[PDB]
RNA sequence: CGAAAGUGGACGUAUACGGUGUGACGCCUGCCCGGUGCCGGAAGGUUAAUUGAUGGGGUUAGCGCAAGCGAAGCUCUUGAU
C-alpha cells in the first residue's frame, strides 16, 4: 500500500488471504431506488461465452448524465454497490432530489458538488468538456454529447484531456492511448474512484471467486472435441485457439462507423 | 447464439470484459527469431474481377470468264491498359 487507509490482510489460519472493506459509510443498508437485476449467462437458447455462474446478487442502483444543473448537491454518504468497485456515494439536492453518482476521491462528509456549465471546478459533478481547462483528471464522459458511458468503471480509472484543444474533440484514456471524442459532451471532472478498492486478492476461489463466476479455466484438457487442441500422451505441441481465434494477438475492430481515433502504439 | 431481427458480454465500460498457458508460497525463470505462426512496414516485383487498345478469322456489296481481293455492318477470337 502506500495510502490511507491501508486494506486489512487476513492471517495464516485457514488458507487466507486479502480482504476488501472501506473507512467506513456508516450504515449497512440501502436506500430504495434499484430493479431486480436479471441471473445467467445463456442468451435465449445456448450458452453464449461460456463461464457465469455462483449466486448472491440483486441491487441495481443508477444515476450517470446528470442532466440536472446549476442546483447544490451534498452528498449524503459514500456506499457500496456490488460488482462494481467504484463506491457510489448518494446527495441530495437543495430540492430533495437524490441521485447517486460514482464516489470520487476526497468525498464524503457533505460537500460542494454543482452541475451544469460553469461550476466549481474540485470534483463536483459533470461538466462540458468545453468549460474545463487541460482536466488532467477529469472523469466518466461520454463518446456523445448526451448519455454517460465511457470510463464508469471509476475505480482509479482516469483521463487526460490536453490543456485546450480545437476542433472539439479529445481525451486520453488509460490503455486507450488516443481518443477524440465531441467537445459538447461533459465530465464529471471528479475523476477517481479509490484504487486499493481493487489491490487486494480475492483469496482462494470459492468464498472469494465461485461468489462470482464459474471456473474461467478449460486449458487444453485434451479430448480433440471439446477444443481446437486435445488428446496427446499428456502435453500440448501445436495451436491452441479456441474456434480458430487465434489467440496470437490479432487484434479485431475493422472499418466501420468510429475507428477515427488517434496516436495508439503497439509497444 | 442467431439466415435476420434481436440477445448474451453488461443495465458492466480498461482497477472492465474475453481467450490462451502456468497452478499457493519461497528463490528463480538462462542462450536461439534460422523453421512455422503472429506483429509492424509496404517503397519495389507478382497478381483477381473490372475497362477492353491492337491484331487475326468468318460472312459479303462491289472489283473480276478465272485466280483471287475484299470495305461497312454483324459476328468469333485476341487480349494492350
Redesign the pocket.
Given at each position: 500500500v502506500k495510502c490511507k487507509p491501508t486494506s486489512p490482510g487476513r492471517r495464516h489460519v485457514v488458507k487466507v488471504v486479502n480482504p476488501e472493506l472501506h473507512k467506513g459509510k456508516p450504515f449497512a443498508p440501502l436506500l430504495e431506488k434499484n430493479?431486480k437485476?436479471?441471473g445467467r449467462?445463456?442468451?435465449?437458447?445456448?450458452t453464449?461465452?461460456?463461464?457465469?455462474g455462483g449466486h448472491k446478487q440483486a441491487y441495481?442502483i443508477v444515476d450517470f448524465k446528470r442532466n440536472k444543473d446549476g442546483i447544490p448537491a451534498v452528498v449524503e454518504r459514500l456506499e457500496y454497490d456490488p460488482?462494481?468497485?467504484?463506491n457510489i456515494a448518494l446527495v441530495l439536492y437543495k430540492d430533495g432530489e437524490r441521485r447517486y453518482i460514482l464516489a470520487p476521491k476526497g468525498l464524503k462528509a457533505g460537500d460542494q458538488i454543482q452541475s451544469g456549465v460553469d461550476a466549481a471546478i474540485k470534483p463536483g459533478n459533470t461538466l462540458p468538456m468545453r468549460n474545463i481547462p487541460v482536466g488532467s483528471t477529469v472523469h466518466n464522459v461520454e463518446m456523445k454529447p448526451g448519455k454517460g458511458?465511457?470510463?464508469?468503471?471509476?475505480?482509479?480509472?482516469y483521463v487526460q484531456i490536453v490543456a485546450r484543444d480545437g476542433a472539439y474533440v479529445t481525451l486520453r484514456?488509460?490503455?486507450?492511448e488516443m481518443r477524440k471524442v465531441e467537445a459538447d459532451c461533459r465530465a464529471t471532472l471528479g475523476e477517481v474512484g479509490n484504487?486499493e478498492?481493487?489491490?487486494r486478492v480475492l483469496g482462494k476461489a470459492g468464498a472469494a471467486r465461485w461468489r462470482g463466476?464459474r471456473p474461467?479455466?478449460?486449458?487444453?484438457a485434451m479430448n480433440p472435441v471439446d477444443?481446437p487442441?486435445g488428446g496427446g500422451e499428456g502435453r500440448?505441441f501445436g495451436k491452441?485457439?479456441?474456434t480458430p481465434?487465434?489467440?496470437?494477438?490479432?487484434?479485431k475492430k475493422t472499418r466501420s462507423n468510429k475507428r477515427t481515433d488517434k496516436f495508439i502504439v503497439?509497444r
Amino acid at each position: 500500500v502506500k495510502c490511507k487507509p491501508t486494506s486489512p490482510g487476513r492471517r495464516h489460519v485457514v488458507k487466507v488471504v486479502n480482504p476488501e472493506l472501506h473507512k467506513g459509510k456508516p450504515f449497512a443498508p440501502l436506500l430504495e431506488k434499484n430493479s431486480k437485476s436479471g441471473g445467467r449467462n445463456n442468451n435465449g437458447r445456448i450458452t453464449t461465452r461460456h463461464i457465469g455462474g455462483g449466486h448472491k446478487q440483486a441491487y441495481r442502483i443508477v444515476d450517470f448524465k446528470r442532466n440536472k444543473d446549476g442546483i447544490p448537491a451534498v452528498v449524503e454518504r459514500l456506499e457500496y454497490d456490488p460488482n462494481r468497485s467504484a463506491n457510489i456515494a448518494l446527495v441530495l439536492y437543495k430540492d430533495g432530489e437524490r441521485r447517486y453518482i460514482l464516489a470520487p476521491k476526497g468525498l464524503k462528509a457533505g460537500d460542494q458538488i454543482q452541475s451544469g456549465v460553469d461550476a466549481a471546478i474540485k470534483p463536483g459533478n459533470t461538466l462540458p468538456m468545453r468549460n474545463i481547462p487541460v482536466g488532467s483528471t477529469v472523469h466518466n464522459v461520454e463518446m456523445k454529447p448526451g448519455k454517460g458511458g465511457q470510463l464508469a468503471r471509476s475505480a482509479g480509472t482516469y483521463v487526460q484531456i490536453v490543456a485546450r484543444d480545437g476542433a472539439y474533440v479529445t481525451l486520453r484514456l488509460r490503455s486507450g492511448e488516443m481518443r477524440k471524442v465531441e467537445a459538447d459532451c461533459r465530465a464529471t471532472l471528479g475523476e477517481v474512484g479509490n484504487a486499493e478498492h481493487m489491490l487486494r486478492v480475492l483469496g482462494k476461489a470459492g468464498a472469494a471467486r465461485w461468489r462470482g463466476v464459474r471456473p474461467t479455466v478449460r486449458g487444453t484438457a485434451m479430448n480433440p472435441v471439446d477444443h481446437p487442441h486435445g488428446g496427446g500422451e499428456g502435453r500440448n505441441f501445436g495451436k491452441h485457439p479456441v474456434t480458430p481465434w487465434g489467440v496470437q494477438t490479432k487484434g479485431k475492430k475493422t472499418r466501420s462507423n468510429k475507428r477515427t481515433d488517434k496516436f495508439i502504439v503497439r509497444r
